[PDB]
Design an enzyme around this catalytic site. Structure first.
Site, PDB file in Angstrom:
ATOM      1  N   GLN A   1       0.823  -1.205   0.000  1.00 44.63           N
ATOM      2  CA  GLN A   1       0.000   0.000   0.000  1.00 44.63           C
ATOM      3  C   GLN A   1       0.863   1.262   0.000  1.00 44.63           C
ATOM      4  OE1 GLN A   1      -4.244  -1.492   1.836  1.00 44.63           O
ATOM      5  NE2 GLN A   1      -2.864  -0.421   3.250  1.00 44.63           N
TER       6      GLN A   1
ATOM      7  N   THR B   1       3.956 -11.366   7.232  1.00 46.84           N
ATOM      8  CA  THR B   1       4.645 -11.336   5.948  1.00 46.84           C
ATOM      9  C   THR B   1       5.720 -10.255   5.950  1.00 46.84           C
ATOM     10  OG1 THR B   1       2.699 -12.143   4.740  1.00 46.84           O
ATOM     11  CG2 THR B   1       4.390 -11.016   3.450  1.00 46.84           C
TER      12      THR B   1
ATOM     13  N   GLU C   1      26.068   8.739  -1.485  1.00 50.89           N
ATOM     14  CA  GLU C   1      27.079   9.622  -0.920  1.00 50.89           C
ATOM     15  C   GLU C   1      26.672  10.055   0.488  1.00 50.89           C
ATOM     16  OE1 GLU C   1      29.255  12.293  -3.730  1.00 50.89           O
ATOM     17  OE2 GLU C   1      28.753  13.847  -2.260  1.00 50.89           O
TER      18      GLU C   1
ATOM     19  N   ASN D   1       0.030   6.984   4.339  1.00 49.18           N
ATOM     20  CA  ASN D   1       0.864   6.575   3.215  1.00 49.18           C
ATOM     21  C   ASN D   1       1.204   7.713   2.268  1.00 49.18           C
ATOM     22  OD1 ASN D   1       0.785   4.037   4.264  1.00 49.18           O
ATOM     23  ND2 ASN D   1      -0.669   3.208   2.766  1.00 49.18           N
TER      24      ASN D   1
ATOM     25  N   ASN E   1       4.733   4.609  12.832  1.00 47.74           N
ATOM     26  CA  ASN E   1       3.347   4.907  12.481  1.00 47.74           C
ATOM     27  C   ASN E   1       2.729   5.919  13.436  1.00 47.74           C
ATOM     28  OD1 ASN E   1       2.593   3.711  10.056  1.00 47.74           O
ATOM     29  ND2 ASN E   1       1.817   1.826  10.991  1.00 47.74           N
TER      30      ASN E   1
ATOM     31  N   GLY F   1       3.633  -7.155  10.796  1.00 45.46           N
ATOM     32  CA  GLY F   1       2.915  -8.189  10.075  1.00 45.46           C
ATOM     33  C   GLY F   1       3.709  -9.479   9.989  1.00 45.46           C
TER      34      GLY F   1
HETATM   35  N1  LIG Z   1       1.866   3.128   7.399  1.00 47.97           N
HETATM   36  C1  LIG Z   1       1.176   2.034   7.101  1.00 47.97           C
HETATM   37  N2  LIG Z   1       1.190   0.957   7.958  1.00 47.97           N
HETATM   38  C2  LIG Z   1       0.484  -0.155   7.644  1.00 47.97           C
HETATM   39  C3  LIG Z   1      -0.257  -0.227   6.472  1.00 47.97           C
HETATM   40  N3  LIG Z   1      -0.847  -1.441   6.425  1.00 47.97           N
HETATM   41  C4  LIG Z   1      -0.500  -2.136   7.532  1.00 47.97           C
HETATM   42  N4  LIG Z   1       0.315  -1.344   8.299  1.00 47.97           N
HETATM   43  C5  LIG Z   1       0.943  -1.701   9.577  1.00 47.97           C
HETATM   44  O1  LIG Z   1       1.596  -2.949   9.421  1.00 47.97           O
HETATM   45  C6  LIG Z   1       1.427  -3.741  10.581  1.00 47.97           C
HETATM   46  C7  LIG Z   1       0.724  -5.039  10.200  1.00 47.97           C
HETATM   47  O2  LIG Z   1       1.430  -5.623   9.130  1.00 47.97           O
HETATM   48  P1  LIG Z   1       0.788  -5.894   7.680  1.00 47.97           P
HETATM   49  O3  LIG Z   1       1.637  -5.302   6.581  1.00 47.97           O
HETATM   50  O4  LIG Z   1      -0.634  -5.391   7.602  1.00 47.97           O
HETATM   51  O5  LIG Z   1       0.738  -7.504   7.628  1.00 47.97           O
HETATM   52  P2  LIG Z   1       1.393  -8.361   6.436  1.00 47.97           P
HETATM   53  O6  LIG Z   1       2.749  -7.829   6.039  1.00 47.97           O
HETATM   54  O7  LIG Z   1       0.440  -8.384   5.269  1.00 47.97           O
HETATM   55  O8  LIG Z   1       1.562  -9.815   7.105  1.00 47.97           O
HETATM   56  P3  LIG Z   1       0.323 -10.830   7.315  1.00 47.97           P
HETATM   57  O9  LIG Z   1      -0.998 -10.172   6.986  1.00 47.97           O
HETATM   58  O10 LIG Z   1       0.328 -11.331   8.735  1.00 47.97           O
HETATM   59  O11 LIG Z   1       0.570 -11.987   6.384  1.00 47.97           O
HETATM   60  C8  LIG Z   1       0.626  -2.913  11.566  1.00 47.97           C
HETATM   61  O12 LIG Z   1       1.506  -2.281  12.472  1.00 47.97           O
HETATM   62  C9  LIG Z   1      -0.067  -1.891  10.697  1.00 47.97           C
HETATM   63  O13 LIG Z   1      -0.350  -0.706  11.400  1.00 47.97           O
HETATM   64  C10 LIG Z   1      -0.272   0.854   5.605  1.00 47.97           C
HETATM   65  O14 LIG Z   1      -0.919   0.813   4.558  1.00 47.97           O
HETATM   66  N5  LIG Z   1       0.451   1.979   5.930  1.00 47.97           N
HETATM   67 MG   LIG Z   2      32.734  13.906  -6.215  1.00 46.93          MG
END
Ligand SMILES: Nc1nc2c(ncn2[C@@H]2O[C@H](COP(=O)(O)OP(=O)(O)OP(=O)(O)O)[C@@H](O)[C@H]2O)c(=O)[nH]1
Ligand SMILES: [Mg+2]
Ligand SMILES: *[C@H]1[C@@H](C)[C@H]2[C@@H]([C@H](O)[C@H]3[C@H]4[C@H]([C@H](OC(C)=O)[C@H](OC(C)=O)[C@@]32C)[C@]2(C)[C@H](C[C@@H]3O[C@@H]3[C@@H]2OC(C)=O)C(=O)[C@@H]4O)[C@]2(C)[C@@]1(O)OC(=O)[C@@]2(C)O
Ligand SMILES: Nc1nc2c(ncn2[C@@H]2O[C@H](COP(=O)(O)OP(=O)(O)O)[C@@H](O)[C@H]2O)c(=O)[nH]1
Ligand SMILES: [Ca+2]
Ligand SMILES: [Mg+2]
EC number: 3.6.5.-
Lengths: 427, 440
Positions: B15, B145, B254, B228, B206, B143
């Site tokens: 995102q 992932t 640099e 975002n 965040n 998350g």
């Molecule tokens: N700034 C920002 N933080 C996000 C966003 N989406 C999720 N997060 C943060 O990411 C964390 C959760 O991880 P995610 O990226 O949603 O989970 P994932 O990487 O998809 O991993 P899984 O869903 O468990 O497979 C939380 O702290 C959320 O607040 C986003 O669009 N912008």
């Molecule tokens: Mg130089």
């Protein structure tokens, strides 16, 4: 009596390009390489820096080197960019990331043989090659690391030729990265051993001249380079025009270097006049002479009064009284005799060239071998130690295969250099 | 050449990727279909924007990017959204089952099933580069992932691409928008695992972004969309050095030389200005001096911490827009005399400055006012370790009871991995303490 010019890295190629613009103008060579001057005095020793090509053209005996193509593309499209031999553009793609190790040991090692092939081609077309001149900075990676690599290689293949450098020293006052003291210390280590003559051009001094004297609140690198190219023109006048004194690289070295390691010169230039109404003011020989010896006109941020002159070369340019020049030069020595070592009799030599530089009716260029230059190396040493104490930023270098011991050794030799100056300052 | 490949991992990474690439397109005049009328070299080129965009013979400018998620619904929105024509279908990679906020599933159970495909698609991008510089990896700490798969990917990238540079934009968890109790576990685990494989990491707190949106943009309850769009402006500032050319435009690599004094100390603090609403920007010129001063207001930082109670090891200013060196130098002079800026005794105190003349851009329907000049400060300060301290404490509270640990163990992990990871973090906090101590 040919000289082979080499310019390495960003700083090296940018001052280098400026140098060729300036002396081309002086010798009557236009960007196409055609002579359009009105004096045989311009062509009498043009063989020193130029090859004569078919169509009665003049081509700089210049080799352009860099580990990234950026700056050299800008040189190619520059004012006199067309004049250079296209085969003499030798460049890589990776860059050196302001890293001496990359320039000296990894990235540069891959490119250096290509450069040496071009050097050899140029050297083979020389009736009697006297030596080499290199333009580079010590604060970066390519000019510093690969430049000193080249110098080492050239010495191996041409051990009986003179090696001359225009070396830009780094300053926090005008800085790109924090590792500049590392790169510079590693380079000085090389220069002390493998050059006969090194012109120490301090960015600190160039900035202070632009700011204080020339009243420029915000100097660019381009404005710094105008000072350098003007100075370079001056110090090489004796090599480029007919004359008696220091007419070649070896005779200059014999006059300027009493001890082999102490071959680091403070260059100076006059006049340095801020814009305004006084820019049109006529300069007298006494005023030229006083200004050329003035510390504020020096290109190395060292106080001459903090040391003693071992040797001095002065060169006046323009129509002026030879008698007056001699009288004023003697005045300087006799009125300030304590600053000239008494154990080298008559250590100031003066030359006068009829041809003035562009935009001035007369000028004077100063070349001093002063023990005050130790202040320059002490500065770098202190900056080096502040970081090396904590092994800060060392991972950039160890990642290229270098060990800490090589830093320790470079530092010790530069500190030895400093103490050697102090020895003769007290003698 | 000097191409850069972006890898967007998990929801947060994807995102944020959407917002960044939309912004890039607007900055370079690239249409949603990939066409760029101003680009006269069709099918290729070595312009600055080519570091981030490849070109097809049909004139399409395609992001050098891969999007990866272990479930399909976030990336599916890319596939059907506004900029769907921008990406080749093979750049957008999805599984059917996510990591369920579990590092173990992201790194092992689920991640292992897709890792080879991801690497193959990245290889496809790399083989189209003539001088690949490195990777930029976008992901959350919290998350399954974002934490688990990212660290697996970083390990595998070190094997397949050696010491080729890898940079991170890492989303640090905040309770206002966090979605899992175990996010402190996932954060410590990925930070430990990735530390040796990352050359430089830009943490994005965040909560800091949340606060900035609430206070400076008067957004009552910020959404990920709000967060975002702000984050993208900051990422753009950092990458603008790579995507635009100019006489005074200093390359990111640099700045990195100055920003990383030791390999483990590679976490710069980002501060950005001006963040201002259209309502308040109207008839209000923020000068170079004003936006530069704002860089030393901790409320404008990307990570909540207090540099005034820490020591600096580097200070970089990345300007964009209507800015000339004269004004920067005057601004810095003033700041040197007034602010709490103490450096460690082993590094120079000079600020490193870069200027990019292309002015800041905003996305339509956004919250940010369009301004004539902006700045992103990148500083290396001991203060950023505060962020580690807060996370590590949350980790300790739960781990002392082994709360939720059975979820990780059930997926094949061992308690030894937890304690090993935590020990590394303790050593890291200690490292930031040691670099701040005066020399002998
Ligand atoms: N700034 C920002 N933080 C996000 C966003 N989406 C999720 N997060 C943060 O990411 C964390 C959760 O991880 P995610 O990226 O949603 O989970 P994932 O990487 O998809 O991993 P899984 O869903 O468990 O497979 C939380 O702290 C959320 O607040 C986003 O669009 N912008
Ligand atoms: Mg130089
Ligand atoms: C920077 C700007 C400072 C440079 C400018 C010109 O090429 C330079 C001219 C030079 C000026 O010297 C001054 C201002 O006292 C100045 O160069 C400096 C300060 O280093 C200029 C404007 C002139 C006027 C020289 C003629 C005569 O010798 C006097 C003086 O140079 C000396 C030795 O002081 C020139 O006519 C020069 O053209 C630029 C374009 C600058 O704007 O950026 C550059 O790269 C530059 C140095 O070429
Ligand atoms: N006088 C001058 N100094 C420069 C210029 N460019 C870089 N420098 C200095 O050289 C050092 C950086 O080296 P650089 O030549 O850019 O790195 P390289 O390309 O790897 O050799 C720093 O100390 C700079 O201040 C220039 O155009 N003029
Ligand atoms: Ca193109
Ligand atoms: Mg998810």
């Amino acid at each position: 009596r040919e000289i082979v010019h080499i310019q390495a890295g960003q700083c090296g190629n940018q001052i280098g390009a400026k140098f060729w613009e300036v002396i081309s103008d002086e010798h009557g060579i236009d960007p196409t390489g055609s002579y359009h001057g009105d004096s045989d005095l311009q062509l009498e020793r043009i063989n020193v820096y130029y090859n004569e090509a078919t169509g009665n053209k003049y081509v700089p005996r210049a080799i352009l080197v860099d580990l990234e193509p950026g700056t050299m593309d800008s040189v190619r499209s520059g004012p006199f960019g067309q004049i250079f031999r296209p085969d003499n553009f030798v460049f890589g793609q990776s860059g050196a990331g302001n890293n001496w190790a990359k320039g000296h040991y990894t990235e540069g090692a891959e490119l250096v043989d290509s450069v040496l092939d071009v050097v050899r081609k140029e050297s083979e077309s020389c009736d009697c090659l006297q030596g080499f001149q290199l333009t580079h900075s010590l604060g970066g990676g390519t000019g510093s690391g690969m430049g000193t690599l080249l110098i080492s290689k050239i010495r191996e293949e041409y051990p009986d030729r003179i090696m001359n450098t225009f070396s830009v020293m780094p300053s926090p006052k005008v800085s790109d990265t924090v590792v500049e003291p590392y790169n510079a210390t590693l380079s000085v280590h090389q220069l002390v051993e493998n050059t006969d003559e090194t012109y120490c051009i301090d960015n600190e001094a160039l900035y202070d001249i632009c700011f204080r004297t020339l009243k420029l609140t915000t100097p660019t690198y381009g404005d710094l380079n105008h000072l350098v190219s003007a100075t370079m023109s001056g110090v090489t006048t004796c090599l480029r025009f007919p004359g008696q004194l220091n007419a070649d690289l070896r005779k200059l070295a014999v006059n300027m270097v009493p001890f082999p390691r102490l071959h680091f010169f403070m260059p100076g230039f006059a006049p340095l006049t801020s814009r305004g109404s006084q820019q049109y003011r006529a300069l007298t020989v006494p005023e030229l002479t006083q200004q050329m010896f003035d510390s504020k006109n020096m290109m190395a941020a060292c106080d001459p009064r903090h040391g003693r002159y071992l040797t001095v070369a002065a060169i006046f340019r323009g129509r002026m009284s030879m008698k007056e020049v001699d009288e004023q030069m003697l005045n300087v020595q006799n009125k300030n005799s304590s600053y000239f070592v008494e154990w080298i009799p008559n250590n100031v030599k003066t030359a006068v060239c009829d041809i003035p530089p562009r935009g001035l009716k007369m000028s004077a260029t100063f070349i001093g071998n002063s023990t005050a230059i130790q202040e320059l190396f002490k500065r770098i040493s202190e900056q080096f130690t502040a970081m090396f104490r904590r092994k800060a930023f060392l991972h950039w270098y160890t990642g290229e295969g270098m060990d800490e011991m090589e830093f320790t050794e470079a530092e010790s030799n530069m500190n030895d250099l400093v103490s050697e100056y102090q020895q003769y300052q007290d003698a | 050449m000097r191409e850069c490949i972006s890898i967007h991992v998990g929801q947060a990474g994807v995102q944020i990727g959407n917002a960044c690439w939309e912004l890039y397109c607007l900055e370079h005049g690239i249409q949603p279909d990939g066409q760029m009328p101003s680009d006269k070299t069709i099918g290729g080129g070595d312009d600055s924007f080519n570091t981030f965009f490849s070109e097809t013979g049909a004139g399409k400018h395609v992001p050098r990017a891969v999007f990866v998620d272990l479930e399909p619904t976030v990336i599916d929105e890319v596939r059907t959204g506004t900029y769907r024509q921008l990406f080749h279908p093979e750049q957008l990679i999805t599984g059917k089952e996510d990591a369920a906020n579990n590092y173990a599933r992201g790194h092992y159970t689920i991640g292992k099933e897709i890792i080879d495909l991801v690497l193959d698609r990245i290889r496809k991008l790399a083989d189209q580069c003539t001088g690949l510089q490195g990777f930029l990896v976008f992901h959350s700490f919290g998350g399954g992932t974002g934490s688990g798969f990212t660290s697996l990917l970083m390990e595998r990238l070190s094997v397949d691409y050696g010491k080729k540079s890898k940079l991170e934009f890492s989303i640090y968890p905040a309770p206002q928008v966090s979605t899992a109790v175990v996010e402190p576990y996932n954060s410590i685990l990925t930070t430990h695992t990735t530390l040796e494989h990352s050359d430089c990491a830009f943490m994005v707190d965040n909560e800091a972004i949340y606060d900035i949106c609430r206070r400076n943009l008067d957004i009552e309850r910020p959404t990920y969309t709000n967060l975002n769009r702000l984050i993208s402006q900051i990422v753009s500032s950092i990458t603008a050095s790579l995507r635009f050319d100019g006489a005074l435009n200093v390359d990111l690599t640099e700045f990195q030389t100055n920003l990383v004094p030791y390999p483990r100390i590679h976490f710069p603090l980002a501060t950005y200005a001006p963040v201002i609403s259209a309502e308040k920007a109207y008839h209000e010129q923020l000068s170079v001096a004003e936006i530069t001063n704002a860089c030393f207001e901790p409320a404008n930082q990307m990570v909540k911490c207090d540099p005034r109670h820490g020591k600096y090891m580097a200070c970089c200013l990345l300007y964009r827009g209507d800015v000339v060196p004269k004004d920067v130098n005057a601004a810095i002079a003033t700041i040197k005399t007034k602010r709490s800026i103490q450096f460690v005794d082993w590094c120079p105190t000079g600020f490193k400055v870069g200027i990019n003349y292309q002015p800041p851009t905003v996305v339509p329907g956004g919250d940010l006012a369009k301004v004539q000049r902006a700045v992103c400060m990148l500083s290396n300060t001991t203060a950023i370790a505060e962020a580690w301290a807060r996370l590590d404490h949350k980790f300790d509270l739960m781990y002392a009871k082994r709360a939720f640990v059975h979820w990780y163990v059930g997926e094949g992990m061992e308690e030894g991995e937890f304690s090993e990871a935590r020990e590394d973090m303790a050593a890291l906090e200690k490292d930031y303490e040691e670099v701040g101590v005066d020399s002998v």
